[PDB]
Amino acid sequence: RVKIANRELEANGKVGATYSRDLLGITKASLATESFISAASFQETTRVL
């Protein structure tokens, strides 16, 4: 999201956002998902819902 947003903005004249990348465990990097019907298959269903 950030890379497309600030990349198009630098494509225009304004300035983006200096981001500092992270590194997450797989049980923690699979824990965040845009889609929830995916993320309710394996996560705790109640909280996702």
Binding site: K28, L31, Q43, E44
Partner: protein, 547 residues
């Protein structure tokens, strides 16, 4: 802080034990419900899991709120849950005896009922209602026992209502000097009658119409004078109490050089309407508005004391109800359902108790409580509800089966229960087929990978897809066969059956739109069946009759 030290060792270690968590608990909270509350707050946050005697990932982002809830529940406990105990606490706060003062509280209740009945005896609309109901009931439209459940032979009752007509004509058609005494005698006679519960219900209903109309015209006078016209309470109380009926305290009020009075000009006729419908309701009764308001406020306060006596005695006897409801705890119905049903039965007991019968209250109300809980256990325990006396037969079979199981030694047979019980030898069989609970369809039959018994209960509404294919193939084939006829032929044989149209037709509508309901279309049909039953044509059709 201490339970937070638990949390820091859990973040470091990554697990716990029951000795650990049981050691870091606050030094008084040993409610097993509360213990589970904290254990779930500790587990579900992560640390996960609490792990009895250990010795894989974890997923959670809301551990901070759980930790906060723990550190808040440390000093001041999250006292109680498990609403059986909540009810125990909330009813145990009672001085749980009413020793020979129950009759004082019943004195109080008799006060309330007698005040409301006397006020009723002051009430015109309900007296007129009972007179009009006397006429209707005398018209074969009702029983003499439904309009009244006896007084303290409804032919004596008829002369009683005739006495009511006499008292009321003398008391009403003389409208102050003697009319008061007329109401006095009517009082002395109506204080000794007796009404059905729903009869005093409609009494209270028309009276509640009365109080609500009076309060709504209160709003029509106040929100048209007090609120709408800047009219304070001082000059309003100055002029409302004292007339309250005639229009001498409003339109004479507008000309009083007052703030509200210099603005009431545009609220004149609506307030005139208010007092006019006020005196109209008065016409409905015949008394001043303040008489009506004082009378039904006396009614309301006696009623409040009566409801309060109800509340007080029942909260005295809740201990009784719990002790008695403990006795049925495996009828298939929850504890608290039993205790609430008992409380309702107790309410009906307090509804109809008299000290002039000499009973004591606990021995009296035990029966009502037990009978109500039995009605409940019969009516809403079994999944597929069965009537009452059916349950009677079931309990009879269970008692006699326990007795026969040792009288005959081995075990009973239906042929023999059909002669101990004098029942017709087949009701025993049907009762024994019906009286059993239904299996929890998610029952585990652990005998496999992991199943639930609902996972095996096959289907029988579906159609075998061979059937679907045959039906479609035969739709097509019959379509072709009807292609082998004429307009008269094909249309008549279609309409004679369900072929690709709406609901079928008999010779009436058929010969109607075909102009002949006679042997004409009958001959058409019979010859149709002739040509179709003709082999070398219908061989495929007979092939669709596989057998």
């Amino acid at each position: 802080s201490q339970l937070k030290l638990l949390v820091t060792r859990g973040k470091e270690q990554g697990y716990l034990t029951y000795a650990e968590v049981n050691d870091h608990l606050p030094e008084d909270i040993v409610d097993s419900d509360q213990i589970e509350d904290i254990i779930q707050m500790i587990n579900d946050m992560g640390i996960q899991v609490m792990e009895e005697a250990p010795d894989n990932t974890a997923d959670e982002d809301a551990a901070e709120a759980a930790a906060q809830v723990l550190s808040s529940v440390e000093s001041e406990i999250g006292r109680t849950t498990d609403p059986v105990r909540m009810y125990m606490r909330e009813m145990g706060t009672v001085e749980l005896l009413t020793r020979e003062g129950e009759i004082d509280i019943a004195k109080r209740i008799e006060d309330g009922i007698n005040q409301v009945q006397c006020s009723v005896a002051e009430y015109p609309e309900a007296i007129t209602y009972l007179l009009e109901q006397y006429d209707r009931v005398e018209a074969e439209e009702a029983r003499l026992s439904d309009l009244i459940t006896g007084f303290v032979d409804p032919e004596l009752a008829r002369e009683k209502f005739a006495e009511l007509r006499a008292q009321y004509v003398v008391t009403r058609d003389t409208i102050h000097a003697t009319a008061q005494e007329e109401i006095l005698k009517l009082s002395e006679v109506f204080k000794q009658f007796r009404l059905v519960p729903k009869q005093f219900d409609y009494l209270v209903n028309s009276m509640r119409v009365m109080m609500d109309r009076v309060r709504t015209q209160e709003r029509l006078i106040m929100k048209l004078c007090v609120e709408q016209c800047k009219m304070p309470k001082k000059n309003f109380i100055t002029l409302f109490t004292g007339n309250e009926t005639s229009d001498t305290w409003f339109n004479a009020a507008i000309a009083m050089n007052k703030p509200w009075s210099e603005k009431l000009h545009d609220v004149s006729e609506e307030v005139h309407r208010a007092l006019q419908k006020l005196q109209q309701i008065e016409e409905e009764t015949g008394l001043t508005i303040e008489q009506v308001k004082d009378i039904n406020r006396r009614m309301s306060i006696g009623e409040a004391k009566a409801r309060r006596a109800k509340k007080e005695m029942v909260e005295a006897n809740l201990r009784l109800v719990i002790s008695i409801a403990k006795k049925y705890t495996n009828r298939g119905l929850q504890f608290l359902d039993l205790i609430q049903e008992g409380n309702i039965g107790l309410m009906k007991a307090v509804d109809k108790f008299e000290y002039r019968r000499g009973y004591k209250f606990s021995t009296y109300a035990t029966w009502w409580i037990r009978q109500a809980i039995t009605r409940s256990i019969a009516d809403q325990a079994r999944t597929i509800r069965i009537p009452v006396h059916m349950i009677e037969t079931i309990n009879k079979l269970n008692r006699i089966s326990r007795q026969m199981l040792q009288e005959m030694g081995r075990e009973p047979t239906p042929e023999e229960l059909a002669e101990r019980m004098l029942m017709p030898e087949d009701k025993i069989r049907k009762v024994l087929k019906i009286a059993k609970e239904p299996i929890s369809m998610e029952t585990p039959i652990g005998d496999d990978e992991d199943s639930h018994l609902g996972d095996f209960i096959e289907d029988t509404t579906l159609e075998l897809p061979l059937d679907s294919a045959t039906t479609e193939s035969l739709r097509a084939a019959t379509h072709d066969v009807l292609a082998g006829l004429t307009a008269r032929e094909a249309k008549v044989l279609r309409m004679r059956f369900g072929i690709d149209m709406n609901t079928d037709y008999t010779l009436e509508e058929v010969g109607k739109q075909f102009d002949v309901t006679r042997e004409r279309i009958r001959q058409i049909e019979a010859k149709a069946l002739r040509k179709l039953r003709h082999p070398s044509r219908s061989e495929v059709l007979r092939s669709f009759l596989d057998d």
